[PDB]
């Protein structure tokens, strides 16, 4: 067993003296992010059309032209129109009878032009509803059978057929809400809001006024019940050069708004920190960010809906869950986030604490920002509140063990100092150190008696040794740790069953009734542990790989019908089918 | 031609009540709206009301709520209007009026009547 | 209610002079209609939308304006053309008649 060296340090005297560090200050716990408990609406931009109801009026004119041959009848023309029903044929008519007459009289082409149906006198027709489809919406018609003339051989002839169809359709209109379409695909150009009265004016139209009528006290008469309407209406009715269309009218204030509302958050926590607020919400796990400042709700253009949403909506959380244990302190807050978002925030007090320019705001499609927030922040605050206890134990700990090692300097100095030095040194308030020098190839005798003095027998074992080979073997006397000292000062009496182990250079020496018996490895004596295990394995790597729901392919390929690709495809008809190249003379 | 006729009782007691007329002639009394105005002694020209004939529908300055309520004679082609609580304030020309039933850039009071003139004193 | 403030409260024409009287408004309206008021007599209808003539008026009167203000002019202002002349509004509720401009002939 040659692994451990041995080691001869003098008495230690001399100026090195060393003291042990006193007990550092241990780190204070950090104190914790005050939070306000509240209630929070939150809105996006709105993306969703104004969708309204809408009546249209119109007359399906066709006009044939059939020649008559032989055998046979050919069409050489169909001309089809579609034609407005006058303003006085809908108040007087449509409305007030159920009924439409006969003649379609209206201006095309710059001129007046009349079809009567049939090519017969003017008569009043009822109006009928239309054969029932899945939905579509309700509609009313005069006539089901077109009109052609009747045959005279080799003759070209004409025939009318006229048409009076009424149709509810729904109706569309987007931001800044000067034009709206129709369930037909038709564009009014003309503001949903447009009127004579009540400052409406302003609104776009790009019709001539006499195009537009208002009728105030308007009741509607059901086209299939029959039945007249109870309240009155105010009715906008646009004459178009194919229809004519009807409308409510509605102030524009309460029916538009810019904004949305999205999320109503019970439990709103607001955080300051950095000059800035956080809003974290742990319902739907997003932290929100915003400045300080709140924002003025007049910066947003036709921004009504907010403050009536986000009173309503604050009011009944209040009386759901915040009815017995909380306050409202003050009036609602507003704030913009970062992405876009407008959190309208009721700051709530609880029972028992009481001792006392115009623009468009736009919001981002992806929330996964905010709940990355979230997140980071819950594992980052609470792995932070455990590290640090840890940091704070730490230090309580090692200046809680420093009583141990003063009470431990006074009993082996040698083995306290040259632990806490980090080299092998001998030492004796102060502690005073000496560093030894490093022999081996040491020789131990077999006898542990004093030849001397028969009645005492030597405690450690006997040693000679060397410092290098070219001096002499010094004798000595085994210590601790394989410290061979230079006396041999270590006297006891003689006792009986007399057993020892001796720590000699990297294995036990076994000296039976003051005898060398034998040495040993350290893989003999049976090991007992003062140690406590800890067992902290790392986290392991992980790959985050794409993954969508659907792609974007799958997205517009859910679409039943491509405009692009029918456009396409029906325009590439004369170069499949055709020659546009060939005249003929 | 188109003639408005109004004739009503002139002289009116205070605290009272009374009843003026305005009849039509020359044209379809239930398609044209009858207002009312009122002219005290030169001053302005205040707008009353008016009523539709057809459908009964009643539009009105809410200055004269509680004191003018207008009603028709469909089989007479008769508007009337009645001013009740008469004070001395009432006393005043009040006209009669035609108006299209619509909103439109031509909508005006294109025919008038003659004016009753009341006079609430004793 | 909406006001209409209609300058001058009287003005003096000399027969053959090009006259004109304003209308301005409290708030825009859609249109503005004028009216003619002799003495022991009805309104009669005079200007309509803002620029069109009633039936049976001279064409030496036209009107323009937009907004919150109009104007009544005479080409050349006859003996005739004597009278009170109010503008009126119904785009709010009331329909209120403005104060009045007198127009007054020199001799």
């Known amino acids: 067993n040659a692994d451990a060296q041995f080691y001869v340090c003098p008495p230690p005297t001399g100026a090195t003296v060393v003291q042990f560090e006193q007990p550092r200050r241990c780190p204070t716990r950090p104190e914790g992010q005050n939070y306000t408990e509240g209630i929070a609406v939150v809105f996006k931009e709105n993306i969703a059309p104004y969708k309204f109801k809408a009546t249209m009026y119109y007359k399906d004119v066709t006009v044939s032209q059939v020649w008559f041959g032989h055998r046979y009848s050919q069409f050489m023309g169909i001309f089809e129109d579609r034609a407005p029903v006058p303003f006085e044929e809908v108040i007087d008519k449509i409305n007030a009878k159920g009924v439409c007459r006969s003649t379609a009289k209206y201006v095309r082409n710059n001129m007046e032009t009349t079809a009567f149906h049939r090519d017969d006198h003017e008569t009043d027709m009822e109006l009928k509803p239309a054969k029932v489809a899945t939905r579509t919406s309700r509609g009313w018609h005069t006539t089901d059978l077109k009109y052609n003339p009747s045959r005279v051989e080799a003759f070209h002839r004409y025939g009318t057929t006229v048409n009076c169809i009424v149709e509810e359709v729904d109706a569309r209109s987007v931001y800044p809400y000067d034009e709206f379409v129709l369930a037909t695909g038709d564009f009014v150009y003309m503001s949903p809001f447009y009127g004579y009265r009540e400052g409406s004016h302003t609104e776009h139209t790009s019709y001539a006024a006499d195009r537009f009528k208002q009728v105030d006290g308007f009741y509607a008469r059901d086209l299939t019940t029959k039945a007249r309407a109870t309240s009155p209406t105010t009715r906008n009715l646009l004459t178009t050069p194919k229809f004519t269309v009807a409308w409510d009218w509605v102030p524009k204030r309460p029916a538009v708004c810019t904004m949305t509302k999205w999320q109503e958050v019970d439990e709103m926590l607001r955080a300051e920190y950095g000059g800035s607020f956080r809003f974290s919400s742990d319902a739907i796990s997003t932290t929100f960010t915003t400045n300080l400042t709140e924002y003025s709700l007049s910066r947003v253009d036709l921004g009504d809906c907010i403050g009536r949403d986000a009173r309503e909506a604050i009011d009944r959380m209040f009386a759901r869950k915040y009815n017995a244990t909380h306050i409202k302190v003050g009036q609602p807050q507003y704030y913009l986030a970062t992405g876009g978002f407008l959190i309208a925030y009721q700051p709530l007090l609880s029972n028992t604490l009481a001792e006392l320019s115009v623009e468009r705001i736009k919001t981002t499609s992806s929330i996964e920002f905010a709940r990355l927030q979230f997140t980071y922040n819950h594992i980052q605050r609470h792995v932070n509140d455990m590290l640090g206890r840890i940091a704070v134990a730490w230090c309580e700990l090692q200046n809680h063990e420093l009583t141990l090692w003063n009470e431990a300097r006074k009993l082996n100095p040698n083995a306290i100092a040259s632990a806490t030095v980090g080299r092998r040194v001998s030492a004796r308030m102060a502690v005073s150190t000496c560093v030894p020098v490093a022999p081996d190839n040491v020789i131990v005798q077999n006898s542990m008696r004093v030849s001397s003095r028969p009645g005492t027998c030597y405690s450690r074992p006997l040693v000679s040794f060397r410092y290098e080979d070219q001096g002499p073997l010094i004798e000595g006397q085994l210590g601790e740790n394989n410290e061979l000292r230079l006396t041999r000062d270590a006297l006891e009496p003689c006792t009986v069953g007399h057993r020892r182990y001796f720590i000699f250079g990297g294995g036990y020496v076994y000296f039976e009734e003051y005898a060398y018996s034998h040495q040993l490895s350290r893989a003999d004596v049976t090991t007992v542990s003062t140690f406590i295990d800890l067992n902290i394995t790392m986290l392991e790597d992980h790959e985050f790989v794409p993954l969508e729901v659907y792609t974007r392919h799958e997205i517009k390929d859910s679409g039943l019908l491509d405009y692009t690709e029918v456009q396409r495809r029906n325009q590439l008809h004369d170069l499949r089918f055709a020659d546009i190249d060939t005249v003929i003379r | 031609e188109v003639q408005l006729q109004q004739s009503g009782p002139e002289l009116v007691k205070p605290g009272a009540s009374v009843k003026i007329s305005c009849k039509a002639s020359?044209?379809?009394?239930?398609?044209?709206?009858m207002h009312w105005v009122k002219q005290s002694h030169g001053k302005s020209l205040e707008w009353i009301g008016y009523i539709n004939p057809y459908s009964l529908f009643i539009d009105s300055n809410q200055k004269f709520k509680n004191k003018a309520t207008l009603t028709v004679d469909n089989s007479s082609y008769t508007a009337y209007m009645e001013l009740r609580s008469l004070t001395s304030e009432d006393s005043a020309v009040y006209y009669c009026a035609r108006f299209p039933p619509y909103y439109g850039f031509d909508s005006h009071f294109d025919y008038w009547g003659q004016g009753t003139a009341l006079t609430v004193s004793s | 209610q909406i006001v209409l403030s209609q300058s001058p409260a009287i003005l003096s024409a000399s027969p053959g002079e090009k006259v004109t009287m304003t209308c301005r408004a409290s708030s825009s309206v859609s249109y503005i209609y004028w009216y003619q008021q002799k003495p022991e007599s009805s309104p009669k209808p005079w200007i309509y939308?803002?620029?069109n003539l009633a039936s049976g008026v001279p064409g030496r009167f036209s009107g323009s304006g937009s907004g919150t203000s109009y104007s009544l002019t005479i080409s050349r202002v006859e003996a005739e053309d004597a009278a009170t002349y109010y503008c009126?509004?119904?785009?709010?509720?009331?329909?209120?008649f403005g104060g009045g401009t007198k127009l007054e002939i020199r001799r």
């Open positions: 939308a803002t620029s």
């Open positions: 009126q509004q119904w785009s709010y509720n009331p329909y209120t």
């Open positions: 020359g044209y379809t009394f239930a398609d044209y709206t």
